Chain A
Amino acid sequence: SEKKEFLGRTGGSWFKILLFYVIFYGCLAGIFIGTIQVMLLTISEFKPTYQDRVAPPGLTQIPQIQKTEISFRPNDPKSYEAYVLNIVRFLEKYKDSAQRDDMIFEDCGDVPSEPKERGDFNHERGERKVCRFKLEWLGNCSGLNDETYGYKEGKPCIIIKLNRVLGFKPKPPKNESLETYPVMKYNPNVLPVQCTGKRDEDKDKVGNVEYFGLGNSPGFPLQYYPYYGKLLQPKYLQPLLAVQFTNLTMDTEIRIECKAYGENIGYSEKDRFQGRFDVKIEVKS
């Protein structure tokens, strides 16, 4: 056994080894920190050096759901309490009291306008003015909208967003009689959005999809884009789109998927949340 008080723990005196190791590790930490810092000196702080791994942005939905299935009982408030609580917690930033003029935010055109930019990416200009987006646009529920009032008028209103990407200005398609056939849609300033899932196979027209946003067209207004950076555009308010299903059958399991069309927006097979967006809705009575 390792004795003591007679000759030492395996001889030693345990200073040369300890001092050598500590000085070696100090030198190694020093060179590591120096390498990291000189690396940091070669990259910018306003724009990434690489953006290709960020494909056309994914259309993630705002209601966070664990098993990607919205299951709830309308009669019992506790069944869907978490969903509405999460929605109001997220949307408390979008409230009209948070949005104000005088270089906090800016006034923006009610109609979908051109994607106006603010200038270059250099630091000669401070925080560029950002648009505003109140909750007045969301509604059409024969009353106030709040966020997720909680009635059984179909289902709790789920609302979808586009992942903000630095220096990215989406381009809506520009042609006549494309593969998309909506009731009312004009090419500029809006990206058309459709919510159809497993059509003619299993869905068999379970419910009616109603979109309400800015400009009455099913899409994100273009005047908000493009992003400029958290360091350059703090508290940036991205455009939002809200959907509601009214005549949705109960006690039925259906799969509905919403996707956004665009010339520069891409779709992938492995990535099930890029561009398109899949979600499950289950309601029981």
Chain B
Amino acid sequence: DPFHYDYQTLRIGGLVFAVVLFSVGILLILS
């Protein structure tokens, strides 16, 4: 299907992934 693949949505998922990992790392170093 030549239509767009989940764009404007995959960016949300990637940003959520990055934020989750950054927060987990900060929590681990702090604690």
What residues make up the interface of A, taking CB atoms closer than 8 Å to B?
50-52, 54-56, 165, 167-168
Closest to B5 in A: A52
Contact count A vs B, C-beta below 8 Å: 14
Name the prevailing secondary structure of the B interface residues: loop
> Would you list the 6 A-B pairs with minimal beta carbon distance, nearest first?
A52-B5, A51-B2, A52-B4, A168-B2, A54-B2, A52-B2
Most buried by B among A52, A54, A55, A167: A52
Query: Which residues of chain B have C-beta atoms less than 8 A from A168's C-beta?
Result: 2
Set of chain A residues within 8 Å of B4, measured between Cβ atoms: 52
Closest to A55 in B: B2
* Residues of chain B lying within 8 A (CB to CB) of residue A50: 5
Closest to A57 in B: B2
B3 at the interface (CB under 8 A from A): yes
Across-interface contacts of A55 in B (CB, < 8 A):
2
How distant is the Cα of A168 from the Cα of B3 in the complex, in angstroms? 11
Flag B1-12 by CB within 8 Å of A: 1 or 0 each.
111110000000
The residues in B between 1 and 27 inclusive whose CB is less than 8 angstroms from any CB of A are 1-5
Contacts of B2 in A (CB 8 A): 51-52, 54-56, 165, 167-168
Question: How far, in angstroms, from A54 to B4 measured CA to CA in the complex?
Answer: 10
> How far, in Å, is A17 (CB) from chain B's closest CB?
41
The residue on A at minimum CB distance from B7 is A52
Nearest residue, chain B, Cβ from A56 = B2
- Which residue on chain A has the smallest CB distance to residue B2? A51
Closest residue of chain A to B4, judged by CB? A52
What are 14 of the A-B contact pairs (CB < 8 Å)? A50-B5, A51-B1, A51-B2, A52-B1, A52-B2, A52-B3, A52-B4, A52-B5, A54-B2, A55-B2, A56-B2, A165-B2, A167-B2, A168-B2
The closest CB in chain A to the CB of B1 belongs to: A51
If A50-B5, A51-B1, A52-B1 are given as contacts, then 4 extra A-B residue pairs at C-beta distance below 8 Å, sorted by A number, are A51-B2, A54-B2, A56-B2, A168-B2
